[PDB]
């Protein structure tokens, strides 16, 4: 009621009037991740809140044994809120240009695509690569899922809605690895993904729809925002651990009253009035991460960190604040936990990568174009090499490779141990084996020619845990006066979590609602409602067959189609179907 959804250029280009009474308001942002930063940016730009009244509370202060590549997930053109934000953030690389400009021009200069998406048998390209290999049964299961109401998917697993045909498809290889879905994850979220990205189905196998920043996410997204916020006087408070927020939850209002913090070791409290807004990033996929090195595994852990402890403390004050235990408890021990960043200047390794991905990793352009999946790896390992180098101060003869394994409790094929028990050099050895490197060189090249840093992340799969409506708090809970939840464990319609777009969307919706900003929020792109996109999807999903080939081997369908074509012959519907290759 305190916001509305829109689309089109009118609302995109319009500027909101200064919101009412904002001169008497303040904001506290809990956490320093992308959602907090984006919310602060919207407070400055569209709330016209004074930067000095904006307080970002970060647990970290103002030494790892090598380079580590973080989230690094791709974006797409229809990250509608994220581009609304980053058109206003100055680039740190190009004069008089925004982050969006630099990104837009870069991905036109050097457009992303994969020349080798799946390998097997120690370095062979998969033979059916490029094809979805979906049977009619699997396709009907996909569409049956989209045709299920989200409300009917409470706690439903991906394995509850798909059968053997689907799980044997190339589609499932592409899908599970690029998005990091496990079979026991949320069918509700998988449905959101299917609908959310249907306009890019023709780019699923070759990653032609992916777009990437010039450098790692921190240098290309976080640092530009931080510079923008600091230039506007926003206050960054470091070594602040937020332990609880006392919230009054009455029959008529929800009002945050006090932030209980541990500053640099000392218990303190921030008293809030109704004009002091609090933005909580509830939960975190990176909390309690541990780090290994070339010779040491990352020590597994089950610690609840400060992020999960805080959400638990808020949930104790109202069921409307969500159910953190659905996301941070009972995570299967087979789940993805470990990622590794393997850095080398060794020509044997780099030349091996070149022979598989067909591009020079040191040229400074696209290399793998996104992850390469090792389809027959016991770990279900994938790895990617982005445009090199991904760190501004890294030597120009080095590459850094990011590696992850979807299965954490199964022996590797060359290193006969679960990934959670492997040092950096052992992870690199298993990877080199699957590249086809000669087995008499693997040990030396991993131990002495590379430096590999593993990271153990207990909650990295947490976004996708099976959930019920109500497990995630509304961005602005009902009757909340000065409290919002942002980030990928907050609830909003149809958008997909594990994306930076979701972080920016929740940030924008929280700020606009709490300040009653008179401007539209862009809806999640309308592609699942667009007949043209749905026609393309049928054509692509059936691996480029028209309606006659699709129905050929079924009399019942073969006849319903002939009756359909009779009615639409010579009409606009027939020309549309022909334009989208269905006729």
Ligand X SMILES: CCCCCCCC/C=C\CCCCCCCC(=O)O
Given the rule CB under 8 A, which residues bind a copy of itself?
8-15, 17, 77-80, 83-84, 87, 97-98, 100-101, 104-105, 108, 146-149, 152, 518, 522, 525-526, 529-532, 570-573, 575
Alpha-carbon dihedral 47, 50, 52, 54, rounded to 10 degrees = -10
Site for ligand X in 352-391 (CB under 6 A): none
Q: Is residue 582 at the binding interface for ligand X, with CB under 6 A as the rule?
A: no
Separation between Cα atoms, residue 19 and residue 74, nearest integer Å: 34
Q: Is residue 150 at the binding interface for ligand X, with CB under 6 A as the rule?
A: no
Closest separation in Å from C-beta 78 to ligand X = 8
**Which residue from 200, 241, 505, 580 is in contact with ligand X, where contact means CB under 6 A?**
200
Residues 6+ apart with CB under 8 A from 254: 247, 248, 318, 320, 477, 478, 479, 480, 481, 483
Q: Is residue 574 at the binding interface for ligand X, with CB under 6 A as the rule?
A: no
Closest separation in Å from C-beta 411 to a copy of itself = 43
Closest separation in Å from C-beta 146 to ligand X = 4
**Alpha helices in 329-423, H assignment, sequence order:** 347-357
Separation between Cα atoms, residue 170 and residue 517, nearest integer Å: 46
CA 383 to chain centre: 16
Q: Which is nearer to a copy of itself, 46 or 182 (CB)?
A: 46
CA-nearest of 579, 544, 550, 548 to 562 is 548
Binding characters for ligand X, 486-525, by CB under 6 A (x = yes): ----------------------------------------
Q: Which is nearer to ligand X, 210 or 455 (CB)?
A: 210
Token look-up 């992916």 returns: 210
**Alpha helices in 370-475, H assignment, sequence order:** 424-435, 439-447
Residues in the chain: 583
Q: Which is nearer to ligand X, 169 or 323 (CB)?
A: 169
Closest separation in Å from C-beta 501 to ligand X = 8
Closest separation in Å from C-beta 323 to ligand X = 27
DSSP annotation of 19 reads: P
When CB distances are held under 5 to 8 angstroms depending on the partner's kind, the choice from K ion, a copy of itself, ligand X, none that residue 262 binds is none
Output the CA angle 416-421-427, nearest 5 degrees: 70
Closest separation in Å from C-beta 85 to K ion = 11
Site for ligand X in 68-107 (CB under 6 A): 74, 76
Q: Which is nearer to ligand X, 194 or 486 (CB)?
A: 194
Q: Which is nearer to a copy of itself, 59 or 495 (CB)?
A: 495
Please state the φ and ψ torsions of residue 491, each to the nearest 5 degrees: -110, 130
Closest separation in Å from C-beta 152 to ligand X = 15
Are the CB atoms for 40 and 29 separated by under 8 Å? yes
Q: Is residue 229 at the binding interface for ligand X, with CB under 6 A as the rule?
A: no
3-state secondary structure of 56: strand
Are the CB atoms for 407 and 379 separated by under 8 Å? yes
Q: Which is nearer to ligand X, 65 or 73 (CB)?
A: 73
Separation between Cα atoms, residue 275 and residue 263, nearest integer Å: 23
Are the CB atoms for 88 and 42 separated by under 8 Å? no
Are the CB atoms for 498 and 463 separated by under 8 Å? yes
Closest separation in Å from C-beta 187 to a copy of itself = 14
Closest separation in Å from C-beta 195 to ligand X = 5
Q: Which is nearer to ligand X, 204 or 378 (CB)?
A: 204
Q: Which is nearer to ligand X, 397 or 571 (CB)?
A: 571
Q: Which is nearer to a copy of itself, 15 or 478 (CB)?
A: 15
Residues 6+ apart with CB under 8 A from 120: 126, 374, 375, 376
For the record, the structure tokens of 38 come out as 């984006």
Separation between Cα atoms, residue 41 and residue 181, nearest integer Å: 31
Stretch that binds ligand X, among 197-205, 319-327, 437-445, 487-495 (CB under 6 A): 197-205
Query: Given strand 381-384, what is the order of strands in its sheet?
Result: 124-125, 118-120, 372-374, 381-384, 399-405, 338-344, 450-456, 290-291
Q: Which is nearer to ligand X, 229 or 460 (CB)?
A: 460
Element (H, E) at 101: helix 99-109
Q: Is residue 194 at the binding interface for ligand X, with CB under 6 A as the rule?
A: yes
Binding site for K ion (CB under 5 A): 11, 520
Are the CB atoms for 545 and 501 separated by under 8 Å? no
When CB distances are held under 5 to 8 angstroms depending on the partner's kind, the choice from ligand X, a copy of itself, K ion, none that residue 198 binds is ligand X
Closest separation in Å from C-beta 445 to a copy of itself = 41
Closest separation in Å from C-beta 105 to a copy of itself = 6
Which residues are at the interface with ligand X (CB under 6 A)?
Answer: 74, 76, 142, 146, 194-195, 197-198, 200-201, 203-204, 209-210, 528, 537
């Amino acid at each position: 009621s305190h916001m509305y959804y829109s689309y089109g250029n009118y609302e995109a280009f319009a500027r909101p009037k200064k919101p009412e009474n904002v001169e008497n308001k303040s904001a506290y942002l809990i956490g320093s991740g992308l959602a907090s930063l984006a919310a602060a940016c919207f407070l400055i730009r569209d709330g016209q809140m004074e930067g000095s009244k904006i307080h970002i509370l970060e647990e970290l202060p103002k030494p790892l044994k090598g380079y580590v590549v973080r989230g690094g997930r791709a974006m797409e053109n229809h990250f509608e809120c994220l581009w609304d934000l980053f058109r206003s953030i100055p680039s740190l690389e190009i004069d008089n240009a925004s982050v969006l400009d630099e990104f837009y021009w870069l991905n036109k200069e050097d457009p992303n695509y994969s020349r080798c998406r799946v390998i097997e048998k120690q370095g062979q390209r998969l033979v059916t690569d490029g094809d979805f290999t979906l049977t009619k049964t699997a396709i009907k299961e996909i569409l049956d899922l989209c045709l299920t109401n989200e409300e009917d998917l409470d706690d439903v697993k991906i394995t509850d809605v798909f059968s053997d045909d689907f799980f044997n498809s190339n589609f499932w290889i592409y899908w599970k690895t690029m998005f990091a879905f496990e079979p026991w994850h949320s069918a509700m979220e998988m449905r959101r993904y299917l609908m959310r990205f249907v306009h890019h189905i023709s780019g699923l196998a070759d990653f032609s729809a992916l777009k990437f920043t010039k450098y790692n996410q921190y240098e290309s997204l976080v640092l530009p925002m931080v510079e923008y916020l600091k230039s506007h006087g926003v206050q960054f408070e470091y070594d602040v651990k937020v332990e609880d927020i006392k919230i009054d939850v009455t029959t008529s209002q929800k009002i945050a009253r006090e932030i209980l913090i541990d500053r640099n070791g000392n218990a303190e409290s921030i008293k809030l009035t109704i004009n002091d807004l609090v933005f909580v990033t509830n939960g975190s996929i990176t909390e309690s991460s541990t780090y290994g090195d070339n010779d040491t595994p990352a020590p597994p852990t089950d610690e609840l960190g400060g992020s999960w402890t805080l959400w638990k403390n808020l949930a104790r004050q109202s069921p409307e604040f969500g159910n953190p235990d659905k996301f941070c408890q009972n995570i299967p021990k087979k789940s993805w936990f470990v990622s590794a960043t393997s850095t080398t200047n060794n020509k044997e390794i780099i030349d091996t990568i070149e022979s598989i991905c067909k591009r020079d990793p040191l040229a400074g352009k696209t290399v793998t174009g996104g992850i390469i999946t090792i389809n027959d790896s016991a770990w279900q390992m994938s790895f990617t090499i982005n445009r090199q180098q991904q760190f501004k101060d890294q030597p120009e003869n080095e590459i850094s490779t990011w590696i992850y394994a979807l299965y954490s409790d199964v022996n590797g094929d060359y290193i006969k141990k679960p990934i959670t028990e492997c040092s950096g050099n052992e992870i690199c050895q298993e990877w080199l084996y699957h590249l086809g490197v000669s087995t008499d060189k693997i040990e030396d090249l991993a131990k002495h020619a590379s430096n590999t840093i593993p990271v153990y992340m207990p909650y990295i799969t947490s976004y996708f845990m099976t959930r019920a409506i109500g497990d995630r708090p509304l961005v602005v809970p009902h009757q909340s006066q000065n409290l919002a939840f942002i980030g990928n464990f907050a609830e909003t319609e149809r958008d997909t979590v594990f994306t930076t777009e979701y972080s920016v969307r929740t940030a924008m919706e929280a700020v606009y609602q709490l300040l009653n900003i008179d401007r539209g929020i862009p809806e999640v792109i309308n592609s699942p409602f667009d007949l043209r996109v749905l026609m393309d999807a049928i054509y692509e999903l059936n691996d480029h067959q028209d309606l006659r080939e699709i129905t050929k081997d079924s009399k019942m369908q073969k006849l319903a189609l002939a009756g359909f074509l009779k009615k639409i012959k010579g009409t606009y519907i027939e020309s549309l179907l022909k334009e989208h290759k269905l006729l």
